[PDB]
Scaffold this active site. Structure first.
Site, PDB file in Angstrom:
ATOM      1  N   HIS A  41      45.042  51.454  41.841  1.00 31.18           N
ATOM      2  CA  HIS A  41      44.030  52.032  41.482  1.00 31.18           C
ATOM      3  C   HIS A  41      43.196  52.919  42.622  1.00 31.18           C
ATOM      4  CE1 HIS A  41      41.655  48.273  42.417  1.00 31.18           C
ATOM      5  NE2 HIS A  41      40.664  48.908  42.630  1.00 31.18           N
ATOM      6  N   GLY A 143      34.712  47.510  46.844  1.00 24.71           N
ATOM      7  CA  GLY A 143      35.207  47.915  47.932  1.00 24.71           C
ATOM      8  C   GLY A 143      36.124  46.709  48.721  1.00 24.71           C
ATOM      9  N   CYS A 145      38.862  45.265  47.173  1.00 22.59           N
ATOM     10  CA  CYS A 145      40.140  45.690  46.732  1.00 22.59           C
ATOM     11  C   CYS A 145      40.965  45.787  47.800  1.00 22.59           C
ATOM     12  CB  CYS A 145      40.066  47.040  45.717  1.00 22.59           C
ATOM     13  SG  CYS A 145      39.483  46.541  44.162  1.00 22.59           S
TER      14      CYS A 145
HETATM   15  C1  LIG Z   1      37.838  46.723  44.251  1.00 22.11           C
HETATM   16  N1  LIG Z   1      37.076  47.386  44.894  1.00 22.11           N
HETATM   17  C2  LIG Z   1      36.815  46.339  42.838  1.00 22.11           C
HETATM   18  C3  LIG Z   1      36.421  44.838  43.208  1.00 22.11           C
HETATM   19  C4  LIG Z   1      35.477  44.363  42.090  1.00 22.11           C
HETATM   20  C5  LIG Z   1      34.097  44.909  42.028  1.00 22.11           C
HETATM   21  C6  LIG Z   1      33.213  43.871  41.893  1.00 22.11           C
HETATM   22  N2  LIG Z   1      33.801  42.751  42.244  1.00 22.11           N
HETATM   23  C7  LIG Z   1      34.981  42.841  42.264  1.00 22.11           C
HETATM   24  O1  LIG Z   1      35.672  41.874  42.886  1.00 22.11           O
HETATM   25  N3  LIG Z   1      37.707  46.185  41.809  1.00 22.11           N
HETATM   26  C8  LIG Z   1      37.072  46.909  40.403  1.00 22.11           C
HETATM   27  O2  LIG Z   1      36.278  47.413  40.251  1.00 22.11           O
HETATM   28  C9  LIG Z   1      38.340  46.566  39.340  1.00 22.11           C
HETATM   29  C10 LIG Z   1      39.147  48.062  38.926  1.00 22.11           C
HETATM   30  C11 LIG Z   1      38.477  48.656  37.876  1.00 22.11           C
HETATM   31  C12 LIG Z   1      37.473  47.836  37.275  1.00 22.11           C
HETATM   32  N4  LIG Z   1      37.390  46.698  38.190  1.00 22.11           N
HETATM   33  C13 LIG Z   1      36.834  45.383  37.953  1.00 22.11           C
HETATM   34  O3  LIG Z   1      36.788  44.413  38.706  1.00 22.11           O
HETATM   35  C14 LIG Z   1      36.119  45.371  36.446  1.00 22.11           C
HETATM   36  N5  LIG Z   1      36.383  44.119  35.751  1.00 22.11           N
HETATM   37  C15 LIG Z   1      37.234  44.188  34.637  1.00 22.11           C
HETATM   38  O4  LIG Z   1      37.275  45.537  34.206  1.00 22.11           O
HETATM   39  C16 LIG Z   1      37.630  42.875  33.943  1.00 22.11           C
HETATM   40  F1  LIG Z   1      38.008  42.266  34.857  1.00 22.11           F
HETATM   41  F2  LIG Z   1      38.502  43.214  33.148  1.00 22.11           F
HETATM   42 CL1  LIG Z   1      36.315  42.314  33.106  1.00 22.11          CL
HETATM   43  C17 LIG Z   1      34.429  45.189  37.019  1.00 22.11           C
HETATM   44  C18 LIG Z   1      34.025  43.852  37.674  1.00 22.11           C
HETATM   45  C19 LIG Z   1      34.046  46.425  37.651  1.00 22.11           C
HETATM   46  C20 LIG Z   1      33.732  45.449  35.434  1.00 22.11           C
HETATM   47  C21 LIG Z   1      40.038  48.878  36.723  1.00 22.11           C
HETATM   48  C22 LIG Z   1      40.440  47.315  36.574  1.00 22.11           C
HETATM   49  C23 LIG Z   1      40.596  46.753  37.567  1.00 22.11           C
HETATM   50  C24 LIG Z   1      40.621  47.931  38.843  1.00 22.11           C
HETATM   51  C25 LIG Z   1      41.004  49.060  38.142  1.00 22.11           C
END
Ligand SMILES: *C(=N)[C@H](C[C@@H]1CCNC1=O)NC(=O)[C@@H]1[C@@H]2[C@H](CN1C(=O)[C@@H](NC(=O)C(F)(F)Cl)C(C)(C)C)[C@@H]1C=C[C@H]2C1
Length: 304
Positions: A41, A143, A145
């Site tokens: 992603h 961040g 990720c």
């Molecule tokens: C990476 N930087 C980030 C880590 C997250 C942000 C807050 N705490 C973390 O560990 N990853 C993301 O933003 C991923 C990303 C997006 C959306 N996403 C999510 O973790 C989201 N969760 C969901 O959609 C759920 F788990 F299905 Cl509920 C959210 C926390 C931002 C709402 C797409 C899905 C996974 C990757 C691509």
């Protein structure tokens, strides 16, 4: 004496962390030999996260779109490939700090150390368990990720986890280093929920043995029980079934303490039915299930 949640030393993994940037997205990469591994992603923008077709988005990506940075110094990307949910970026320099390593897919109940990273730089280290619902109880912000989970066997780093996402209960989901998610989760911003968070029974028992080793043995009762009879009680409190394999794995701790696993099960049974009555075990007011039998042995015998 004393018993603490203990991470593996993180030095060998710190040398593999890099920053990966593509478009406006910056996240962490793992640099091993001449390959950088990161979550796929990285290719997505804020619009794309709803329902991205990652293959189609990759058509519009060239090697030069991926900026890879180790410290202040840039690594030239000479190739890219998508493997399941991770991206493999081939660079023209092998990491001079590459430790001995392998990629393992861990089982539920097993533990590992997380080096939480932002912008390719370490924030800190903590210990996690792969929960039976295939989530982890981590600490991650935007961040984080591409932060990795690992174990160390003497000199060999076993990479087991890469961080991708957070679920509604404030728990986390990610992949092995081949890009396969633990659990049924997908890297898409859609409705997803963790299943029932059950307790890792064998780990609780391991931790009770740790308590006894450290002189904290008030909870030891005069009862025993059978495996089936304990398991009836386990099911009620959302504890995982205890198997004969779990009994065998506790053998080293059972032998050290001289307390049979089924005797300890009977003491656990009483803690489940009566609670702790305001008392603590190894400084904890609840039953801890994120120490493996191996974790306990290592800490109590001083493995390095
Ligand atoms: C990476 N930087 C980030 C880590 C997250 C942000 C807050 N705490 C973390 O560990 N990853 C993301 O933003 C991923 C990303 C997006 C959306 N996403 C999510 O973790 C989201 N969760 C969901 O959609 C759920 F788990 F299905 Cl509920 C959210 C926390 C931002 C709402 C797409 C899905 C996974 C990757 C691509």
């Amino acid at each position: 004496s004393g018993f603490r949640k203990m991470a593996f030393p993180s030095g060998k993994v710190e040398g593999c962390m890099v920053q990966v940037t593509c478009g406006t997205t910056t996240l962490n990469g793992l640099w091993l030999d001449d390959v950088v591994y990161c979550p796929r992603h990285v290719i997505c923008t804020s619009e794309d996260m709803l329902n991205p077709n990652y293959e189609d988005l990759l058509i519009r990506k060239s090697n030069h779109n991926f900026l890879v940075q180790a410290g202040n110094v840039q690594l030239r990307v000479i190739g890219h490939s998508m493997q399941n949910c991770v991206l493999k970026l081939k660079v023209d320099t092998a990491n001079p700090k590459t430790p001995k390593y392998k990629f393992v897919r861990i089982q539920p109940g097993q533990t590992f150390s997380v080096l939480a990273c932002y912008n390719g730089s370490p924030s800190g280290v903590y210990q996690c368990a792969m929960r039976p619902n295939f989530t982890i109880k981590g600490s991650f912000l935007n961040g984080s990720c591409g932060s990795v989970g690992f174990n160390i066997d003497y000199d060999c780093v076993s990479f087991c986890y890469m961080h991708h996402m957070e679920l509604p209960t404030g728990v986390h989901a990610g992949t092995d280093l081949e890009g396969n998610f633990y659990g049924p989760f997908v890297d898409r911003q859609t409705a997803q929920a963790a299943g029932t968070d059950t307790t890792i029974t064998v780990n609780v028992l391991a931790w009770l043995y740790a308590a006894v080793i450290n002189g904290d043995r008030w909870f030891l009762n005069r009862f025993t029980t059978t495996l089936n009879d304990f398991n009836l009680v386990a099911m009620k409190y959302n504890y995982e079934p205890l198997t004969q394999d779990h009994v065998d794995i506790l053998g080293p701790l059972s032998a050290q303490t001289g307390i049979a696993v089924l005797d300890m099960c009977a003491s656990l049974k009483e803690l489940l039915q009566n609670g702790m009555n305001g008392r603590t075990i190894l400084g904890s007011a609840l039953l801890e299930d994120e120490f493996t039998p191996f974790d306990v042995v290592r800490q109590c015998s001083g493995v390095t």
